[PDB]
Design a binder for this molecule. Structure first.
Ligand code: 413
Ligand code: CA
Lengths: 55, 247
């Protein structure tokens, strides 16, 4: 079910648990969350952990 | 790097080369435009504190191809719980004098959230380590991470040995064929998770390089994320060596 402990909560990057309600996703510096509420997207030209030439 | 392939120029853009008066000191890790993460033990000997250089976009140490970016090291920050002669807390944070300009060839490595690292990154089977150790190219390697209790059980016992501590972790191979090495000290142990790379370890120590029945021991970065994030917002200080308290 929908918890961070289960497969990072289905979140692409950061996952957040709350006590009564379902887990929420988040993103790293320079990334932000997409409409599926799980995936991240760069809000910069060179976000960390991405290799330019390989994309 | 024993038994590794060449890292195709560009595929390791966070790799840092550290120089003191031109002499090769260590490898480091870029995390943003201004900060670098390397091993504390790299600075044991250092006398001439004012001649440190961090080199980025570097690939082949035998030719300047233009992409190289060199910055003076304004500061070396080390935990107060690190003490030379002991392998524990082997981590150093380095501020640069002026920022680096991010290119196709100079990109920072993500520094993950403590929880995310311990919960998810700690269990990604394989991670890449890299370092330089006619054509002096950057070398990369794929090592499997082992949890401490296995690492001890799989390791060949010696009379005099350091404990693997809550600030270390073992990755690598027992058959004596592949390993990081002294010259790679401070370099990234980089972990891919769902399309992004994150720093999980620092080349810390090992029993020789690629010795049979021995693994490479890495600094467990997840322990230092709050310690690093806090210090990256800290105001510039007089002097190069700073011994910030841990935790
Ligand atoms: C830091 O520490 C260290 C380091 C070392 C190395 N590294 C390495 C190795 C291996 C590896 C693998 N295999 N992977 C990795 C890394 C190195 O780096 N080495 C170097 C020389 O010798 O010169 C040094 C040492 C110390 C200090 C400074 C410097 C080596 C060794 C050590 O340690 C040992 C000990 C110490 C003290 C006490 C006990 C033990
Ligand atoms: Ca070069």
């Amino acid at each position: 079910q929908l918890i961070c402990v289960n497969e990072n909560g289905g979140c692409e990057q950061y996952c957040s648990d709350h006590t009564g309600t379902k887990r929420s996703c988040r993103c790293h510096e320079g990334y932000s969350l997409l409409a599926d509420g799980v995936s991240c997207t760069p809000t910069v030209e060179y976000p960390c952990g991405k290799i330019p030439i390989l994309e | 790097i024993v038994g590794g392939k060449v890292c195709p120029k560009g595929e390791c853009p966070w790799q840092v080369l550290l120089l003191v008066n031109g002499a090769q000191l260590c490898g480091g890790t870029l995390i943003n435009t201004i900060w670098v993460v390397s091993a504390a033990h790299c600075f044991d000997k250092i006398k001439n504190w004012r001649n440190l250089i961090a080199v980025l976009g570097e690939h082949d140490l035998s030719e300047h191809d233009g992409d190289e970016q060199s910055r003076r090291v304004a500061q070396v920050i080390i935990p107060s719980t690190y003490v030379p002669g002991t392998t524990n807390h082997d981590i150093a944070l380095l501020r640069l004098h002026q920022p680096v300009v991010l290119t196709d060839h100079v990109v920072p490595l993500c520094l993950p959230e403590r929880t995310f690292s311990e919960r998810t990154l700690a269990f990604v089977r394989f991670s890449l380590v890299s370092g330089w150790g006619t054509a002096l190219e950057l070398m990369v390697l794929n090592v499997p991470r082992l949890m401490t209790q296995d690492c001890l059980q799989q390791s060949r016992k010696v009379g005099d040995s350091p404990n693997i501590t809550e600030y270390m972790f073992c990755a690598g191979y027992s058959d004596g064929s592949k390993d990081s090495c002294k010259g790679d000290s401070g370099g990234p142990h980089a972990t891919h998770y769902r399309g992004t790379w994150y720093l999980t370890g620092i080349v810390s120590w090992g029993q020789g390089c690629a010795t049979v029945g021995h693994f490479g021991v890495y600094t467990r970065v997840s322990q230092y994320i709050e310690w690093l994030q806090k210090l990256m917002r800290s105001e510039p200080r007089p002097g190069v060596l700073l011994r910030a308290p841990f935790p």
